[PDB]
Design a protein around this ligand. Structure first.
Ligand SMILES: [Zn+2]
Ligand SMILES: [Zn+2]
Length: 1102
């Protein structure tokens, strides 16, 4: 711990407790004065302070009984899925049963109903078919005692049982009632007037067939139609609805939606039960994609002879399907078809009578609308790449083509245009077919433009993913292996497909050379027989906490957002993986912050040591004002509509009970570690299993490698966060006050660094007007222009000595935060803050590596990205992998995927990925080009060093002339220059002037400078500049230079006159150095706090 206080962190009294106690999962000293108590519950009860801890005790005890009961009545222990479901059941929570192929939902439903009836609770079990009612009641009756009132209802019911069920359901206080969905639909009013504690729905689709059934099931727990209709109007509007806090419903449990959850009705579950009826979108895949260069049926024969069994062939059309079918039939292979004898061959393949199934892209995907046996399909063969083909003529042209063409050409003025109308609009404007196809070849990058036969081929990645997916799912807790083979000869098509597969599924396609068929077939078969074995369960549930919503969204993109529980302030998503379930949620920033209330501006002092005091953050959803103090309304606009991180914290504490293991996935910096600690410390009394993961990339790889890096919270980083925060708080407050008494305004000084930088700008104004040195520009005859010192008047330049040398020029290292901000904000006409934000969205959308780095280091994987991209662009001989740095916390800002900006624009306009502005694309382009240059070969150049005499001055001039051999100059331009000959060049034009030696600052120049001086860190750079702008201390002019205002000058003048020590660059740098030493556990936390205090105490007197 760091010995600090958190305001609502007590597990029992719900109040203030120290970091150190929560760490030991203890209540506050008020609740329990003792150091190391014997047993918490017992001791709380003894001191008569037992309050909220009871909930947890009773929770644990009410669950461990369930588990115990289940382990007694049934075979063995609970599966991970059933474990999480059980923990949700004792909380009375309603949910979908998110899980793979037959994890035993019916077993859980039964044992739940049984365990509840054991207490006196009444439950109902709903099934689609009338046969399932029979089978379930059968299994129930033999395990249930006489104490349990069991009834049933279905089609083939008896003559006295049908009425027995009705009278008993009317008065006789039943326990468990097993019936069909038909009964629900038919006897709506009867059930609606009854109250159930537990309702188990086996098939959600059958019950969602009617709209009436939603209201029926909702009224089966005790919810009036008033709340239902009000919520209905709210969901008809387009916003969320709030359940009355005074409501205690039963437990509704359903399975995953097979078909799409169509309609408005399911939203009632989102407000009344806080669970969404999700569809099973399982992205869990273990497929090996191999590509064969030729559509040779001989290769196909050889492959088929290796695979032998359970092969699925996909043809583009049925014609090539029939052709392939004939060729294989002739070569004596047990084969089937989908076009002729669909059902017969389908089931014959299902059983094993057929080894090879040949289908079409559109035929199979629609015939298999029912079953689709996964335990049979090991290998998927693609006879050609699945793709969408369009014609490139002035006629036969699709909408999106003429759209992207005319929008760029200039015609598209936005008024929605009919296709044939657009054809007739382009029929006059740059109209030839030749001109057209050329505009298409020029615009469309990341598709295949067959300009030969006038065609456009767009590989259907989705279809490939689904179809390939048919060879790998989760069976008996085992994610079985599958091989997907593609037979493609067109390199352009294969490359396009590969890029969009890497983009969406992050899955690679390998070549036939780098693939051992014997080994692969073996892995497949072995995993299959491993799943055939008797399962002993390894599945666990896992909670992953991140700070920003974007991270959660892109995480859901590769984990698959099946269902989303709305828990107070947050939205926790759930996903199915091969290792078990996986819950992930976003905090939506910081939770705690230093209190302004007491001690030394929030920092208290006891026993010679400093104690930081934190309180939950509150943000008014109206005006946007943030505060720490506990108030009912907004201190500014007096509004009650606020966001309280204490609710978020409570929500986390709730979720933490269901999860077996927890991982905090905040950013890999001091900020992130501090948040991670504010969270882990708070949760620590609730869950014993809490660890830390640092994701440098927001992708499956970043995540896997992040979990390789699993560790506990590093207190040195937390300590460093604290120190920096305390410095800004103390110095900021003191200086700001001193300014309140001089310039009227309250909040003015954000810290020391800010004032230092502003000082740089202010005095720069002075030293700029003084650098005014007289100069002269010279346009030389059939040569370059030369910039030389003022007084020249000879009109002739003589060449004195001339020497040339061959040299290989190295590219610039990859972007770091400083580099990226400077170059990008210079090349673009943007502020460093705008750039920093674009970078943040870029990292958070998993497109680049961590954007807050002071290292240029590049891993073998980064180098590999560069390599594959170069191999893709054909210029792979120019690849030169460079680590760039050994000393590195993180890597430099680089792309995560070998995809350029143009291809991304294509994927965006196409609709594969979304949410990227033009600015994002341009920034990405800059990062990309920098990185590749840094990974491309050294450009071999012949440069000359010309010594020239101009007006009795021997002045050398070094210039590159010939580029002997290309390299990184393809990404980042390399400028040549006309050769000088050892003669006399005459001056054409002399443009005399006086431009300044020391130029003004630009935002880029300021960042560069503070990086050059050792002031600020990667996180603070842009924020510092922006603060300077927000406070009105600085402005930008015509040519976008940074200039101080009247106010800024007044302020820095005051601060320099009086408080020069606390604004001096030497002091700022010395402190920056020391704090950074604290971050590495090289300098003492409490000691530097003592230092900052000792200078603050000195400042309170001046
Ligand atoms: Zn307490
Ligand atoms: Zn407000």
């Amino acid at each position: 711990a760091v010995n600090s206080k958190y305001h609502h962190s007590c597990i029992n009294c719900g109040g203030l407790n120290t970091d150190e106690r929560n760490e030991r999962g203890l209540p506050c000293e008020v609740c329990l004065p003792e150091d190391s108590p014997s047993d918490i519950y017992r001791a709380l009860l003894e001191r008569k302070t037992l309050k909220e801890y009871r909930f947890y005790h009773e929770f644990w005890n009410e669950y461990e009984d369930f588990r115990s009961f289940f382990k007694k009545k049934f075979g063995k222990d609970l599966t991970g899925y059933q474990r999480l479901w059980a923990k949700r059941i004792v909380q009375g929570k309603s949910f979908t049963m998110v899980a793979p192929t037959g994890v035993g939902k019916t077993t859980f439903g039964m044992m739940t109903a049984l365990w509840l009836a054991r207490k006196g609770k009444k439950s109902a079990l709903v099934f689609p078919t009338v046969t399932l009612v029979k089978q379930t009641l059968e299994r129930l009756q033999k395990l249930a005692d006489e104490k349990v009132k069991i009834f049933g209802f279905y089609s083939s019911m008896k003559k006295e049982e049908k009425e027995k069920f009705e009278k008993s359901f009317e008065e006789d206080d039943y326990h468990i009632l097993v019936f069909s969905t038909q009964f629900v639909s038919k006897n709506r009013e009867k059930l609606s007037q009854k109250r159930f504690d537990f309702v188990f729905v086996d098939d959600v689709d059958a019950v969602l067939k009617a709209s009436r059934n939603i209201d029926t099931l909702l009224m089966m727990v005790g919810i009036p139609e008033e709340i239902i209709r009000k919520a209905f109007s709210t969901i008809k509007q387009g916003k969320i609805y709030e359940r009355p806090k005074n409501l205690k419903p039963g437990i509704l449990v359903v399975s995953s939606a097979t078909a799409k959850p169509r309609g408005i009705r399911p939203l009632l579950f989102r407000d009344l039960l806080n669970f969404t009826v999700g569809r099973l979108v399982s992205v869990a895949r273990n497929i090996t994609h191999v590509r064969i260069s030729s559509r040779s049926k001989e290769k196909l024969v050889e492959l088929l002879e290796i695979f032998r069994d359970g092969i699925l062939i996909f043809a583009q059309t049925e014609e090539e399907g029939k052709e392939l079918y004939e060729y294989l039939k002739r070569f004596k292979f047990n084969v089937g078809e989908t076009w002729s004898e669909f059902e017969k061959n389908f089931e014959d393949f299902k059983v094993g009578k057929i080894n090879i199934l040949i289908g079409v892209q559109a035929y199979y995907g629609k015939l298999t609308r029912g079953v689709d046996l996964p335990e049979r399909i090991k290998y998927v063969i693609f006879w050609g790449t699945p793709s969408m083909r369009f014609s490139l003529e002035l006629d036969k042209a699709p909408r999106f083509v003429l759209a992207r063409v005319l929008k760029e050409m200039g015609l598209i003025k936005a008024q929605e245009n009919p296709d044939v109308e657009e054809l007739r609009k382009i029929a006059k404007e740059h109209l030839t077919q030749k001109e057209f196809v050329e505009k298409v070849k020029e615009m469309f990058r990341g598709v295949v433009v067959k300009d030969e036969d006038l065609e456009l081929i767009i590989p259907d990645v989705y279809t490939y993913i689904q179809a390939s997916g048919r060879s790998s799912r989760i069976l008996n807790g085992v994610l079985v292996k599958g091989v997907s083979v593609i037979f493609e000869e067109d390199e352009e098509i294969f490359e396009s497909l590969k890029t969009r597969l890497l983009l969406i599924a992050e899955e690679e396609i390998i070549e036939e050379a780098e693939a051992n068929w014997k080994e692969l077939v073996h892995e497949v078969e072995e995993s299959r027989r491993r799943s055939e074995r008797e399962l002993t369960d390894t599945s666990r549930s896992l909670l992953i906490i991140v700070e920003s919503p974007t991270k959660a969204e892109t995480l859901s993109r590769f984990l698959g957002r099946a269902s989303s529980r709305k828990e107070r302030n947050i939205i926790v998503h759930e996903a199915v993986t091969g290792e078990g379930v996986i819950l992930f949620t976003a905090t939506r920033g910081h939770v705690y912050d230093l209190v302004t209330k007491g001690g030394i501006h929030g920092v208290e002092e006891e026993n010679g040591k400093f104690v930081p005091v934190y309180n939950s953050l509150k943000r008014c959803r109206d005006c946007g004002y943030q505060f720490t103090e506990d108030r009912d309304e907004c201190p500014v606009c007096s509004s009650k509509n606020i966001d309280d991180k204490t609710e978020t914290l409570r929500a986390l504490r709730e979720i933490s009970l269901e999860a077996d293991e927890i991982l905090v996935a905040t950013d890999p910096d001091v900020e992130g570690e501090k948040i991670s600690w504010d969270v882990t410390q708070y949760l620590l009394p609730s869950t014993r299993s809490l660890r830390r993961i640092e994701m440098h990339e927001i992708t499956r790889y970043g995540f896997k490698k992040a979990r390789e890096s699993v560790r506990f919270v590093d207190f040195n980083l937390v300590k460093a966060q604290i120190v920096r925060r305390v410095q800004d708080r103390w110095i900021g407050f003191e200086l700001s006050g001193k300014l309140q008494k001089r310039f009227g305004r309250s909040n003015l000084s954000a810290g020391r660094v800010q004032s230092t930088v502003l000082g740089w700008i202010v005095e720069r104004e002075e030293e700029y007007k003084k650098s005014e040195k007289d100069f002269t520009l010279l346009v030389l005859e059939n040569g370059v222009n030369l910039e030389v010192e003022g007084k020249i008047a000879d009109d002739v330049v003589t060449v004195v000595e001339l020497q040339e040398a061959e040299e290989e020029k190295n590219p610039l290292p990859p972007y770091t935060t400083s580099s990226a901000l400077s170059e990008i904000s210079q090349k673009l006409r943007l502020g460093v803050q705008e750039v920093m934000d674009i970078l943040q969205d870029l990292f958070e959308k998993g497109f680049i590596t961590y954007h807050r780095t002071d290292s240029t280091r590049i891993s073998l994987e980064g180098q590999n990205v560069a390599r594959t991209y170069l191999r893709k662009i054909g210029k792979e001989d120019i690849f030169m992998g460079r680590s760039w740095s050994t000393e590195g916390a993180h890597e430099a800002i680089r792309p995560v995927k070998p995809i350029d900006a143009r291809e991304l624009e294509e994927m965006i306009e196409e609709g594969l990925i979304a949410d990227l502005t033009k600015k994002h694309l341009r920034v990405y382009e800059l990062i990309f080009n920098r990185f590749l240059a840094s990974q491309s070969a050294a450009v071999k150049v012949k440069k000359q060093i010309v010594t020239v005499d101009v007006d009795g001055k021997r002045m050398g001039i070094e210039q590159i002339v010939e580029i002997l051999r290309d390299g990184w100059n393809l990404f980042v331009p390399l400028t040549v220059s006309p050769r000088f000959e050892h003669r006399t060049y005459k001056i054409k034009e002399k443009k005399f002037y006086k431009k300044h030696t020391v130029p003004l600052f630009t935002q880029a120049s300021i960042v560069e400078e503070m990086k050059k001086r050792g002031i600020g860190r990667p996180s603070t750079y842009a924020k510092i500049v922006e603060v300077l702008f927000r406070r009105g201390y600085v402005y930008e002019d015509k040519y976008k230079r940074v200039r101080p205002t009247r106010f800024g000058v007044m302020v820095y003048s005051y601060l320099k006159e009086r408080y020069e020590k606390y604004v001096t660059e030497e002091t700022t740098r010395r402190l920056e150095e020391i704090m950074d030493k604290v971050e590495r556990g090289e300098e003492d936390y409490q000691a530097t706090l003592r230092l900052l205090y000792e200078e603050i105490k000195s400042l309170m007197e001046e």
